[PDB]
Design a binder for this molecule. Structure first.
Ligand SMILES: [Mg+2]
Ligand SMILES: [Mg+2]
Ligand SMILES: [Mg+2]
Ligand SMILES: [Mg+2]
Ligand SMILES: [Mg+2]
Ligand SMILES: [Mg+2]
Ligand SMILES: [Mg+2]
Ligand SMILES: [Mg+2]
Ligand SMILES: [Mg+2]
Ligand SMILES: [Mg+2]
Ligand SMILES: [Mg+2]
Ligand SMILES: [Mg+2]
Ligand SMILES: [Mg+2]
Ligand SMILES: [Mg+2]
Ligand SMILES: [Mg+2]
Ligand SMILES: [Mg+2]
Ligand SMILES: [Mg+2]
Ligand SMILES: [Mg+2]
Ligand SMILES: [Mg+2]
Ligand SMILES: [Mg+2]
Ligand SMILES: [Mg+2]
Ligand SMILES: [Mg+2]
Ligand SMILES: [Mg+2]
Ligand SMILES: [Mg+2]
Ligand SMILES: [Mg+2]
Ligand SMILES: [Mg+2]
Ligand SMILES: [Mg+2]
Ligand SMILES: [Mg+2]
Ligand SMILES: [Mg+2]
Ligand SMILES: [Mg+2]
Ligand SMILES: [Mg+2]
Ligand SMILES: [Mg+2]
Ligand SMILES: [Mg+2]
Ligand SMILES: [Mg+2]
Ligand SMILES: [Mg+2]
Ligand SMILES: [Mg+2]
Lengths: 93, 110, 66, 47, 72
RNA sequence: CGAGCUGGAGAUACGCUUUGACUCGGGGAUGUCCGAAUGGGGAAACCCACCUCGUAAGAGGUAUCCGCAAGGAUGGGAACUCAGGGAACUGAAACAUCUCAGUACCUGAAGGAGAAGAAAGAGAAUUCGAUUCCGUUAGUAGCGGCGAGCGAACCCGGAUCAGCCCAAUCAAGCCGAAGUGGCUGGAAAGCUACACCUCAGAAGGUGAGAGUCCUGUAGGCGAACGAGAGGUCGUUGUUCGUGAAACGAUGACUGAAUCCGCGCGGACCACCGCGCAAGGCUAAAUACUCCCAGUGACCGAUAGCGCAUAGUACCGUGAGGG
RNA sequence: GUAGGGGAGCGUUCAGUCCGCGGAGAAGCCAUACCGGAAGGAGUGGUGGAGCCGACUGAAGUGCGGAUGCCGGCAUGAGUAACGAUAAAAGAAGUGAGAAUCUUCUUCGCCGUAAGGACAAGGGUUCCUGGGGAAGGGUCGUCCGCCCAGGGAAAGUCGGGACCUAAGGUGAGGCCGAACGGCGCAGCCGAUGGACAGCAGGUCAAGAUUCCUGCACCGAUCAUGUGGAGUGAUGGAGGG
């Protein structure tokens, strides 16, 4: 439900500075929709979301010994709020 | 092919129990049961002894170092004890109480 | 507990009970992939509790219908 | 000069795939007679 | 696919030269063996509600005598 | 079951469990998307919906045919069975009837088997008495460019038995006897001196070969749940290749008697015998073997399945090879 | 003495049975001048690490130099031929365990309707950062499109769908056909086409009519107004 969806947050130089801008970025759930993600974060973060984007990404097929395998493919999502409405739980990172 | 395979993955004894080494170099010695691995049918008695080198591994400890600790064993040179005799000592299974099951020798119990 | 603490409680609580169990499970995740998640168990345990909850509301809702 | 094999995704799939292979009898037959030989490669759908 | 009964089924075919003789000429030697098939015709009649369909010839008689379930 | 557990996996940290875990037997619940797919489309696993209830989050339904409904059918199954269809190479030292052979293959349907079945029959004794199966008769009677070659049945012995109706106990587990001393040895189970068990000396593990260490075996117990008509024309079937061609069998034409009647007895006739067509079901023995178990003058790493595992790597647009 | 028939036997395994050996060491392997008429078989020494010889009898996948035989390994040819366009390289500097080959610098040489740039089809992480150097690189490599780990891709207006139809593929009823099946009107699928609202600049190591800045456009639902009587399809025509 209004949580399950947000499978993680995104971690990198980029993500961090975007955060600094007031733009937050998570991995999500491939099957999901943008309306669904909006409803999601708007619900579990009490924020005004006015900006959104998503992008499905493959998964670095890697080998560990004679076992060529694909990783699970994710769906990076970016959201921009309004009026400097920074989110608390990640504001320390 | 597993070791408990032909031993119905069955541990005749238990974690705690004193034991005596039947066959081997450690013929007859006492040990509390510190580790009893049923499937592999392996088990640790405070006797055995061993000198192991734990290689470089910088963390923890830059240099290696060594270690006097002890190599496990096969529950088939493990022997339960008889409080009287204390030796090569089979087991019978009887009932004290009151649906509590137990364990005698030819003169119980343990 | 496993039997005595679920069947004593009513399902309109179960909905948001599920909900909160989720929420903590999620924050746990965020932690985990942020590091360090020093108590991995708590995750699987929360899973266990959830499965309990649903098994409960299920068997129950279908046994009250007798 | 120029070669036999010039890949075409739509061709490949609309030719050898699964909706395709099941559309005909002898393709059902190809299917299960493959399955029996324990193909991981069931069909070019499974690429 | 007649009225009563399906049909269409049949049949191979032979055929032989220096045939005919003093009951036995010397004898008959044969040349052939291949295969054929057989059929019927079309007719439009009734049952329960409204139908049209195929009908044989034997069926044509068997039905113009009287309704063996279906009618005209 | 009773002490360990946290899958192979062999890794750390997290933990769980004598209020009984883990593993085992037995039910339940949850089971995304694709696939008979089945709400509509689609390049399988993706796209777009409409309807009912919900506050939403959700949940249900939305294929087609037989049916009044209830309900049944669709797809899969290595072989085994039945059916519609039906090859050729080959052999006859050439070929065409013929043989390969109703074999290979295609297809339809169905089951744990199926098929067949309750006499217008075999038949030749005025005998047997539904079928399927095996033995046998028997390479006999016969078929055949009378060449290659093809090849019954009645009787006799067994397997298993049935004849009914309609239309005027195994599946989790528990419990189970009896040896120690010295010796060689890295290590005892082996050597040895004396021991005891046996309804138990089948086997496997243990530092090298153990009846008496372990797991077991003989034996004994053993669960709440769990499982037991005629005729004519073209043809064909049986050993049946137009041969004296009976009979069945159907494609096209014809379509009689119903008891003082009908059908057969290998052309055909009388006689004299065996028989009740036009309506259905039927266990049993029989076939197979994906799977489970037990065995072996079967293999042990070029063997044995293709594989100590993998239909994977690799080749192929594909079928397919491997 | 060839084809051939006959006679007696040697060895290999599996098997029944007895003699019996073996961690003070089995089989297998290695050396040798012993024995038997031969197939063969013994003695001892070195190997090895857990099984085996002998007699009698039984049953065979039972004895290989050949089959341009099959599998595998290793030789010859040979330190030969070749290192994949005759667009061409030098010196300095740096780094490193090691440099003709990797990184700076300054020149030289070649392409320049290309040997530049942007797309599509195809490929699939080859992109960027940091690292590695077994093998891939026709040499070398400290380097790489190879190895490891981590990051990177953002759209109401671009492109496709939520719209359309072509060829073609389908397709209830429909027309046929030993079976599987073959046709087939409407309807539906089908871009290579019709339709359609956004441009200019900025920047990550790595995205860009997406993100960010500046100023636009389109549909949708509600509200205050101008409302103040018509809205205009599953059919008509125009237009496309
Ligand atoms: Mg997008
Ligand atoms: Mg990689
Ligand atoms: Mg257990
Ligand atoms: Mg659920
Ligand atoms: Mg569908
Ligand atoms: Mg036929
Ligand atoms: Mg021929
Ligand atoms: Mg011939
Ligand atoms: Mg079927
Ligand atoms: Mg005739
Ligand atoms: Mg005939
Ligand atoms: Mg007849
Ligand atoms: Mg070998
Ligand atoms: Mg092999
Ligand atoms: Mg022997
Ligand atoms: Mg041997
Ligand atoms: Mg050779
Ligand atoms: Mg030559
Ligand atoms: Mg030279
Ligand atoms: Mg030369
Ligand atoms: Mg030379
Ligand atoms: Mg040269
Ligand atoms: Mg070159
Ligand atoms: Mg040059
Ligand atoms: Mg410089
Ligand atoms: Mg230096
Ligand atoms: Mg160069
Ligand atoms: Mg270019
Ligand atoms: Mg690069
Ligand atoms: Mg090199
Ligand atoms: Mg360096
Ligand atoms: Mg069609
Ligand atoms: Mg287009
Ligand atoms: Mg446009
Ligand atoms: Mg467009
Ligand atoms: Mg914009």
């Amino acid at each position: 439900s209004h949580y399950d969806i947000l499978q993680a947050p995104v971690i990198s130089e980029k993500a961090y500075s975007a955060m600094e801008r007031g733009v937050y970025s998570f991995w999500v759930s491939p099957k999901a929709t943008k309306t669904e993600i909006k409803d999601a974060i708007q619900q579990a973060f009490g924020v005004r979301v006015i900006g959104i984007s998503t992008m499905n990404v493959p998964g670095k097929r890697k080998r560990v010994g004679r076992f060529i395998g694909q990783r699970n493919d994710r769906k990076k999502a970016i959201v921009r709020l309004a009026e400097g409405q920074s989110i608390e739980a990640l504001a320390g990172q | 092919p597993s070791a408990g395979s032909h031993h119905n993955d069955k541990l005749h004894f238990k974690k705690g129990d004193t034991v005596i080494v039947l066959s081997g170099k450690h013929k007859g010695q006492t040990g509390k049961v510190l580790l009893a691995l049923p499937r592999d049918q392996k088990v640790v008695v405070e006797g055995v002894n061993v000198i192991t080198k734990n290689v470089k591994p910088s963390m923890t400890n830059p240099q290696g170092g060594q270690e006097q600790r002890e190599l496990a064993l096969h529950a088939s040179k493990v022997a339960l004890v008889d409080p009287e005799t204390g030796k090569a000592t089979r087991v019978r299974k009887q009932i004290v109480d009151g649906k509590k099951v137990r364990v005698a020798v030819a003169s119980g119990k343990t | 507990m496993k039997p005595s603490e679920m069947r004593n409680l009513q399902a309109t609580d179960f909905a948001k009970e599920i909900d909160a169990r989720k929420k903590e499970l999620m924050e746990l995740r965020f932690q985990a992939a942020a590091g360090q998640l020093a108590q991995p168990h708590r995750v699987r345990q929360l899973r266990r509790e959830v499965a309990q909850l649903n098994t409960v509301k299920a068997e129950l809702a279908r046994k009250g219908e007798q | 000069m120029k070669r036999t094999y010039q890949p075409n995704n739509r061709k490949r799939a609309k030719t050898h795939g699964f909706r395709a292979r099941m559309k005909t009898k002898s393709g059902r037959n190809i299917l299960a007679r493959r399955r029996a030989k324990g193909r991981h490669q069931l069909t070019v759908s499974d690429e | 696919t007649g009225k009563k009964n399906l049909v269409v089924n049949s049949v191979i075919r032979r055929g032989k030269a220096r045939a005919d003789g003093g009951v036995g000429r010397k004898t008959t030697g044969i040349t052939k063996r291949v295969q054929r098939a057989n059929l019927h015709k079309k007719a439009i009649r009734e049952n329960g509600q409204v139908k049209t369909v195929w009908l044989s010839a034997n069926a044509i008689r068997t039905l113009s005598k009287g309704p063996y379930k279906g009618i005209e």
